[PDB]
């Protein structure tokens, strides 16, 4: 049986570590689902 | 049960200890995670029992207790926060600039930040803390790291 714990209020955080790129992808989405790469 | 608005772990006993298997957002009496996350089973708070009340597979979402409430939507301009609370530690604001998925049926924004699986149904929030959608249904790019989408449901 899965059970549910808090972890904490939904808040934006001022000054929090700011990381990761914004890559443009052409994607498909199947019935599944699933996300894949259009190449 | 606890129900008070947050975000929270969803666990199992199943396998080896207590084990995270994702995460979820509880606003306004509705609990919210990814459909690959629980596979649309019951879930436990406390005592109390959560039922499904709604999910699709194809988005990757489900409710339970009530409808889909969240319906804030990335404006394609702005960074944005993940909310990460990964298993065995504690949840975590991590900023970034979305990328985009671009579909036959419309663009999407999309995160490329690098968690364990059972991070999966950790919300990712505007400026005004409002949840824009659930981070975990997604790819893996050209150099193994994942990228994924901003996924969000649709408040009837
Ligand atoms: C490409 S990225 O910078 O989004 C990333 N690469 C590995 C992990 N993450 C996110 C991150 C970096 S430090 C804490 N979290
Ligand atoms: C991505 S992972 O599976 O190595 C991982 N294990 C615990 C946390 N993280 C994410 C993380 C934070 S900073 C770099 N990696
Ligand atoms: C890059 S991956 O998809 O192969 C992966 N392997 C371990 C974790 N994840 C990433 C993840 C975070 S939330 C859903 N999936």
Known sequence: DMYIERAGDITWEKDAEVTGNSPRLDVALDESGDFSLVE | ?156
Request: aromatic fraction near 8%; hydrophobic fraction near 35%; charge should be neutral.
């Open chain 2, 1 to 156: 049960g606890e129900t008070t608005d947050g975000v929270y772990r969803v666990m199992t006993r199943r396998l080896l200890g207590s084990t995270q298997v994702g995460v979820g957002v509880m606003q306004e009496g509705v609990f919210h995670t990814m459909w690959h996350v629980t596979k649309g089973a019951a879930l436990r708070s406390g005592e109390g029992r959560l039922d499904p009340y709604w999910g699709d597979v194809k988005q990757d979402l489900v409710s339970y207790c009530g409808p889909w409430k969240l319906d804030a939507a990335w404006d394609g301009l702005s960074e944005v926060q993940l909310l990460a609370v990964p298993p065995g530690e504690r949840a975590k604001n991590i900023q970034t600039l979305p990328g985009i998925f671009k579909t036959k049926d419309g663009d999407i924004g999309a995160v490329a930040l690098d968690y364990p699986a059972g991070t999966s149904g950790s919300p990712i929030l505007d400026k005004c803390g409002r949840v824009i959608g659930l981070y975990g249904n997604g790819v893996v790019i050209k150099n193994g790291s994942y990228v994924s989408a901003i996924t969000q449901g649709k408040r009837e």
